[PDB]
Amino acid sequence: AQYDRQIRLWGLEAQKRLRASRVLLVGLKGLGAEIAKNLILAGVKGLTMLDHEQVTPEDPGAQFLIRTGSVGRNRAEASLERAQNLNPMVDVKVDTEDIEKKPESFFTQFDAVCLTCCSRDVIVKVDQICHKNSIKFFTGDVFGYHGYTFANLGEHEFVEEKTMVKKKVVFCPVKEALEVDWSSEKAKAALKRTTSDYFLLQVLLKFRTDKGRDPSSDTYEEDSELLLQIRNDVLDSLGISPDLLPEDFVRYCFSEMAPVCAVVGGILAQEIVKALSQRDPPHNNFFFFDGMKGNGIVECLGPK
Amino acid sequence: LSRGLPRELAEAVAGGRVLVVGAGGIGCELLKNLVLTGFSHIDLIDLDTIDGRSKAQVAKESVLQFYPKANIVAYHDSIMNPDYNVEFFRQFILVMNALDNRAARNHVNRMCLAADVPLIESGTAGYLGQVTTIKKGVTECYECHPKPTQRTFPGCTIRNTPSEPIHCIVWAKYLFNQLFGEEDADQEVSPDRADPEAAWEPTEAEAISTKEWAKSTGYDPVKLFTKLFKDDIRYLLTMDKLWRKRKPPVPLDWAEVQSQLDVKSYARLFSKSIETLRVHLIWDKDDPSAMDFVTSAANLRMHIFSMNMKSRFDIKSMAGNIIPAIATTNAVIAGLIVLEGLKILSGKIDQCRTIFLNKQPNPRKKLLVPCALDPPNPNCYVCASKPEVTVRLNVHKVTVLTLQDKIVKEKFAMVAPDVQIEDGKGTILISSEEGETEANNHKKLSEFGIRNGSRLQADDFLQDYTLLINILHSEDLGKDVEFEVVG
Ligand SMILES: COC(=O)[C@H]1[C@H]2C=C[C@]([C@H](Cc3ccc(C)cc3)Nc3ccccc3)(O2)[C@H]1C(=O)OC
Ligand SMILES: [Mg+2]
Ligand SMILES: [Zn+2]
Structure with a gap:
């Protein structure tokens, strides 16, 4: 049982691996603020908050890390002082350049990358860069009562208790997870067991691609009509009945709600912690939250 | 819509007055979510009392540093103080508990039942957690089934x-x-x-x-x-x-x-x-x-x-x-609590659920598992109509003081009890007014005629709660057990 003690010493080392990990966080809006707070309190070595946008007059006056009346300055700069005060042992850097213009060498300094408020093209490109450098990749967003998290940990090994063993779990790229072939006979069966939040994510990603923005409460009339059109185009492109996503979805997917940010940000940050520490199994590979029904569903989409 | 919420719901949130009982535990995360959601009128109270100062006042100072325009009302007296009566609880459209002390949670549960104010309860245990809603006559209360101390x-x-x-x-x-x-x-x-x-x-x-x-x-x-x-x-x-x-x-x-x-x-x-x-x-x-x-x-x-x-x-x-503890569990639970509060302020209490936070997905891929709220337990000794219990003790050895402190106040969680005997004459055993029945404390229950089958009516007028106690005389039990509740 010599291999038994090799796992035990590697299990207690999980906290040291967490305290030595550096994380990149892109997007410091409602969801990113919660993720940053949870990671900084968790004790990671460093956290880099990257956001190219500035605080707009349409942003809510009450914000977590951004002091009231900061309209005009960078969102990551305004979030620095409050984020750093959460834990002095964590060095919190601030980056203002566009994530899409960063070189590949910029990401190598990080052990994990978490994207929020990014387009589909940026999500895929960064996940491909991270897989190219063996960097753990995460993404998430919130919209109305709904939220989601995605993880791509490649070939991930961890320690789990029975009474303690080591396992391996294989993740797939986000590109394959976002374009699933539903024409197989086995896929059509899993299609009945797949939560509609996955297709809600597809509709909103397509909205963010075309409009260059997320649905807004101010323009709820025009946005909800376009969302109803996009869900017909996207679900027809995948060979699926458009009625798999009910028509009333436009009423519960607008703006970012603070309670939804806390739920999704809590689940996402804990998945990053257990991945950096390589302790406990991670969710493979999607998590979908429905704030209206109280549902938190883990789906494995991509493989096969 | 207003920040994803309907216009009518955002108005109820802005004008709604809510009560947070407890500054520790999930309270920190809960106060953040309430303010960021738009709750302006927030009352905070805990279990401490002053002559800095109280936990609620200290927490209010840190809240105003994050958002100075918040209207936090902090109390420097314990929620167990008799001043916080049913009329006090009726001011709020929602009460959220952040305490873990069972005796205080039992008290708040009874106060919210008497005030007919929805009470959101919760718990945490590592990766695990849960949230539920308590409403008089619709759901089961906090004491319908016993629960371990967190x-x-x-x-x-x-x-x-x-x-x-x-x-x-x-x-x-x-x-x-x-x-x-x-x-x-x-x-x-x-x-x-x-x-x-x-x-x-x-x-x-x-x-x-x-x-x-x-x-x-x-x-x-x-x-x-x-x-x-x-x-x-x-x-x-x-x-x-x-x-x-x-x-x-x-x-x-x-x-x-x-x-x-x-x-x-x-x-x-x-x-x-x-x-x-x-x-x-x-x-x-x-x-x-x-x-x-x-x-x-x-x-x-x-x-x-x-x-x-x-x-x-x-x-x-x-x-x-x-x-x-796991800090992210508090953040998840606090977010669910406010989500359940939005349903209550929307007049859609039927959409409220008991939500379980699991460590790993269940056989149906659910990490967060909702379930329908259960109806009131007909055998609950707190929220049922004319509740009754049966207590087995030695009437010749148990004193009135033991009945007051260990049975009625400790076991049955009454704060200021009034206990009388159902003997027709309304014989008074225990009075919540100090200076009345102190001379009874040393007397055995049998000195008042209490025997096998005697019925005691315990009233706690602060909690608006009346409990009938059936006495079963037994000389067994043992020289280490003074009483025990049947069932
Ligand atoms: C000293 O701590 C405390 O008393 C608690 C209590 C008082 C303040 C506090 C805070 C409440 C809060 C209200 C509004 C906004 C916009 C943010 C936060 N929540 C919190 C939670 C997690 C990380 C940081 C802050 O809730 C918390 C604090 O400031 O933590 C250091
Ligand atoms: Mg009271
Ligand atoms: Zn009950």
């Missing part, structure tokens, strides 16, 4: 700043797991220099484990009293930011406390249980050497941090559901 605390409190008294019993139970059990990072007992409140700066020479220092030492009891009760305590004093408003601890010396519940004997018991355990692992609350190790190690730490120690029977009664 003893889930962050590692920063157990290791660095343990506010008495359960935090030391947890530290003693963590100490048992590190030395004689499955060593875990969530149950470390060493000084937590990663605590963000500590702001630990390394020294010049700084440029280790608790079980390893006992492994090479051969589990020396006198060496384990050292390092753990004097060197770790003197290392806590090097973190100066921890001792600015709270009193700092004082180390214990073995060569002094032994040369001069009992104080100096618990140090002797600490060295006796280590020698027995090293000859023999899973912690068992019915084990002789295991409970003696926890009782001695906890009481030694309770004296280091300046507080009255506790007996062995009280340590055994506690230390049941000791689960280390």
